[PDB]
Design a binder for these strands. Structure first.
Ligand SMILES: Nc1ncnc2c1ncn2[C@@H]1O[C@H](COP(=O)(O)OP(=O)(O)NP(=O)(O)O)[C@@H](O)[C@H]1O
Lengths: 40, 706
RNA sequence: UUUUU
């Protein structure tokens, strides 16, 4: 039923990794200070 | 007619196990695992946990339908671990974008080989565990996108989102377009027709699909009702489930014969050690109003205020100096100091997730949130308090259903921290106790397929050489549910005979006349030929999937987007991503109303042809759908203005403006490589310039979970 | 009087 992706690729541009980003580490910086929280 | 069957394999005093087998197939029992566990756990799994793990271990699709507080994520973690061990790729899809960010955070913390892929952000897109949104997966499936070539599992989270008349169609598109050699894990809330979904999966991609259904919750709930006028809570239902009609009658008699209110109840709750608390309201003004009304009470300790200072300081240090002086930051800081906070869709998206982090930590002890804090978002509380019961849905003004009540009330009760959860309900105006008994006793809802036809569907399926719109119409869940009432359309043999004959015999063209009309419009305009093959004009429209692509492509080809500037083009494009209404109509200059009037003329020309071809469209809502309420805001923003300078020109919440700008950046991205289809180079880079002068200070900021 | 890519 479902054909191969080769025929899906034709007639349209491919899929690109627009707006690539990397972990700034801010979340780890905040978690580093979370030492005596009520939950932990 | 579909040929499936259910076997209902026995389960030992736990959940209910059933498997949908395709027609003539013998039920071979699940073989025990041979090897080592793919993922050990620090605790002891429950019955449905073990059953789902066993279903995954045998490379067979499984559906689990339970509560959110039951531990339904463990199965997906096991599937991801086992696919990692066997050197296979995984896909984890979520409906909401923020949910995707939180899921990526919590799964990078555990597996260490993951990748995020949404419209806005793409992190390490070479991994065996990709976290994506549903629309990115559908775009990949429609294009070549050779990333599912080596994938073995696909995990759908919150499968019940396929109940939206607006966005539940891409879900079915994604499910139908997937290959026949992949296995799925569907996660559900409690639904009546769990079996029918497994039957649909079995009929769809020739394989068994198990069903796990349980109603177990680790922490029992206790519901109360507070009549309008009185002191004290009336325990309607308890940890055993009986309705206790005497207290419902007592409360309703109080509300009848007798007929700061929230302040007193919150003080009562916080006096008898019932923290934390979630107060659910269905208007964003009421949340802020209640927070101001509680401003005169303090719950945090001296050290807790230092902690909230330390955690807020970095989050706003990421925000540059100019934005730290915004009114909202200084408005919210004292409230977070005292121990209270608000959560609604009008806040800045950075303050929202700051408050989410603070509530998860435990420093927020009374939150005032809207409906979409419980649906998703991974933090429970001890008490849930409803302030009203009526809500505006979008088309009328309506009471909360039992499904919504269960969803919001299930957030009360934390495993191991507290013995029981406390739920409080407020009734204020002639409850007329036919309803209120339904809310606290009924099941949640069945899930039904909407699956309306769209122009993008037809345009994409006419481009592919081996699939047609008729196939996707036939294989939809709508058709599957509409073939199921053969036992009861034929069984009317005992006037009503004419009626029952008509009804059953009639339907053969279900959503086929609409498809014919859409095709007729398409070949009338010029997107497809008479022989029904896509053209150059219709391949441009295939690259646009955020706004109305027909009218946008009509602009592209008529010559409306050239001889315009970049600022007044990206201001014109704002009419296609803003759909909320405002009290007042701003006044536009000639250089900002000419393009609007040409937009409206093109819309009228589109609608005339669309309505002379038997399609039921009224040419008042089509032109009223494009709302130029933010065109001057967008124009000012793409000139070098400040965010503070610009959120004073309209009575629209800042969060709404930020959402509109993010959607417009996405639409500009798609218009870039929709203009780079017809060899347009003067126009292609104008959209890129407009993209460059949007994302400058605060609308586009790094996520706290990312 | 909410909502969402
Ligand atoms: N059978 C179990 N026994 C004990 N703890 C469990 C069990 N199943 C799950 N848990 C824990 O309880 C938590 C339930 O919270 P949950 O809402 O599922 O988090 P999540 O967002 O799904 N991830 C899980 O994350 C586990 O840490």
């Amino acid at each position: 039923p479902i054909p191969d992706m080769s025929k899906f690729a034709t007639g349209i541009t491919p899929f690109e990794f627009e707006n690539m980003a990397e972990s700034t580490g801010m979340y780890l910086r905040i978690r580093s200070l979370l030492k005596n929280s009520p939950r932990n | 007619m579909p040929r499936v069957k259910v076997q209902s394999v026995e389960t030992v005093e736990g959940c209910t196990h059933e498997v949908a087998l395709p027609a003539e197939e013998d039920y071979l029992p699940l073989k025990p695992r041979v090897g080592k566990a793919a993922k050990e756990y620090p605790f002891i799994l429950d019955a449905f946990q073990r059953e789902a793990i066993q279903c995954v271990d045998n490379n067979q699709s499984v559906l689990v339908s339970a509560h959110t507080s039951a531990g339904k994520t463990v199965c997906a973690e096991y599937a991801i671990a086992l696919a990692l061990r066997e050197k296979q790729r995984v896909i984890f899809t979520s409906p909401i974008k923020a949910l995707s960010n939180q899921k990526y955070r919590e799964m990078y913390e555990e597996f260490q080989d993951v990748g995020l892929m949404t419209g806005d952000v793409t992190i390490n897109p070479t991994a065996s565990c990709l976290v994506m949104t549903t629309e990115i997966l559908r775009s990949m499936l429609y294009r070549g996108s050779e990333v599912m070539r080596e994938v073995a599992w696909v995990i759908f989270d919150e499968i019940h989102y396929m109940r939206d008349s607006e966005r539940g169609v891409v879900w079915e598109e994604t499910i139908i377009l997937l290959p026949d050699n992949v296995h799925y894990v569907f996660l559900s809330a409690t639904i009546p027709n769990a079996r029918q979904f497994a039957e649909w999966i079995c009929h769809l991609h020739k394989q068994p699909c198990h069903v796990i259904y349980t109603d177990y919750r680790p922490t029992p709930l206790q519901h109360y009702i507070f009549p309008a006028g009185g002191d004290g809570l009336h325990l309607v239902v308890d940890e055993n489930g009986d309705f206790r009609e005497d207290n419902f009658n007592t409360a309703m008699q109080v509300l009848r014969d007798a007929g700061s209110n929230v302040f007193k109840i919150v003080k009562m709750i916080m006096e008898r050690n019932f923290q934390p608390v979630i107060i659910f309201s269905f208007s964003k003004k009421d949340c802020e109003a209640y927070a101001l009304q509680m401003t005169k009470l303090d719950f945090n300790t001296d050290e807790e205020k230092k902690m909230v200072e330390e955690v807020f300081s970095n989050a706003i240090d990421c925000l540059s100096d100019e934005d730290k002086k915004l009114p909202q930051v200084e408005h919210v800081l004292p409230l977070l100091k005292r121990g209270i906070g608000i959560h609604h869709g009008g806040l800045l998206p950075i303050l929202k997730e700051t408050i989410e982090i603070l509530f998860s930590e435990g420093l927020i002890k009374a939150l005032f949130a809207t409906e979409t804090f419980a649906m998703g978002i991974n933090m429970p509380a001890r008490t849930v308090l409803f302030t009203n019961a009526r809500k505006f849905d979008g088309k009328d003004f309506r009471w909360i259903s039992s499904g919504e009540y269960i969803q919001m009330s299930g957030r009360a009760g934390r495993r191991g921290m507290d013995d029981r959860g406390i739920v409080i309900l407020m009734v204020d105006e002639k409850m007329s106790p036919t309803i209120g008994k339904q809310l606290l006793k009924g099941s949640a809802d069945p899930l039904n397929s909407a699956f309306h036809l769209t122009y993008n569907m037809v345009l994409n399926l006419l481009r592919v050489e081996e699939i047609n719109p008729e196939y996707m119409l036939e294989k939809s869940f709508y058709q599957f549910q509409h073939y199921r009432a053969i036992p009861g359309v034929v069984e009317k043999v005992k006037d009503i005979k004419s009626a029952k004959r008509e009804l059953k015999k009639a339907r053969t063209v279900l959503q086929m006349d609409e498809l014919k009309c859409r095709k007729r419009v398409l070949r009338r305009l010029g997107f497809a030929t008479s022989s029904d093959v896509i053209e150059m004009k219709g391949r441009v429209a295939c690259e646009i999937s955020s706004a109305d692509e027909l009218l946008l492509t009509e602009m592209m080809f008529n010559g409306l987007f050239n001889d315009l500037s970049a600022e007044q083009a990206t201001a014109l494009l704002s009419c296609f991503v803003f759909q909320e209404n405002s009290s007042e109509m701003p006044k536009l200059t000639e250089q900002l109303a000419g393009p609007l009037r040409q937009m409206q003329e093109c819309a009228k020309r589109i609608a005339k042809v669309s309505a002379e071809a038997k399609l039921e469209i009224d040419e008042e809502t089509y032109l009223s759908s494009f709302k130029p309420h933010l065109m001057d805001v967008v124009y000012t923003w793409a000139t070098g203005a400040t965010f503070a300078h610009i959120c004073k020109m309209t009575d629209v919440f800042e969060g709404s403006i930020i959402r509109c700008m993010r959607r417009l950046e996405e639409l500009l991205r798609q218009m870039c490589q929709a203009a780079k289809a017809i060899g347009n180079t003067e126009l292609e880079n104008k959209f890129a310039e407009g993209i460059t002068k949007i994302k400058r200070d605060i609308v586009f900021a790094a996520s706290l979970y990312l």
